[PDB]
UniProtKB/Swiss-Prot annotation:
<protein>
    <recommendedName>
        <fullName>DNA gyrase subunit B</fullName>
    </recommendedName>
</protein>
<comment type="subunit">
    <text>Heterotetramer, composed of two GyrA and two GyrB chains. In the heterotetramer, GyrA contains the active site tyrosine that forms a transient covalent intermediate with DNA, while GyrB binds cofactors and catalyzes ATP hydrolysis.</text>
</comment>
<comment type="similarity">
    <text>Belongs to the type II topoisomerase GyrB family.</text>
</comment>
<comment type="function">
    <text>A type II topoisomerase that negatively supercoils closed circular double-stranded (ds) DNA in an ATP-dependent manner to modulate DNA topology and maintain chromosomes in an underwound state. Negative supercoiling favors strand separation, and DNA replication, transcription, recombination and repair, all of which involve strand separation. Also able to catalyze the interconversion of other topological isomers of dsDNA rings, including catenanes and knotted rings. Type II topoisomerases break and join 2 DNA strands simultaneously in an ATP-dependent manner.</text>
</comment>
Amino acid sequence: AGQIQVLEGLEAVRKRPGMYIGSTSERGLHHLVWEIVDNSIDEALAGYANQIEVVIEKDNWIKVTDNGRGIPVDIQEKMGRPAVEVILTSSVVNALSQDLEVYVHRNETIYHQAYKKGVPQFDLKEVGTTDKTGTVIRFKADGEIFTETTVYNYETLQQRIRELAFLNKGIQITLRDERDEENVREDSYHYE
């Protein structure tokens, strides 16, 4: 029933995306970034993170990295699935992305899963080791949903990132545009 309810949720979000994120215009595209960054900010507010990095990657992928606890990976009695899988298969960003990848650094281990339109492409796997904790989410917005544009505006991202750092003092939040490898721009904000 659990995994059935997952698939139905994905279908629901992709049928009426504007009901979930306000619009499928440039505004809604940027809302994807906010949803992910908001979750990292909660982890800092909980006492466990203090650095968030947003990278606009080649072809308008977005990568958001935080140094929090890592999304948990323990198998849920609820779903029989890893917690991270449950969390990400119920995410609007994941549903509205053509592709999305997660790397969790936790338990001295790096765990990876990938998704398309919210559907896991393989079971969560151990890919490496680590001495850090945190979460990396990389996604590519689905152009079948975002029919006007899938191109981010640096100044839009910058203005809100600066506002978020000012509002949440002590969190370092960095924005980097890597879309043109010959001119990489970075702005980093850290209030008191």
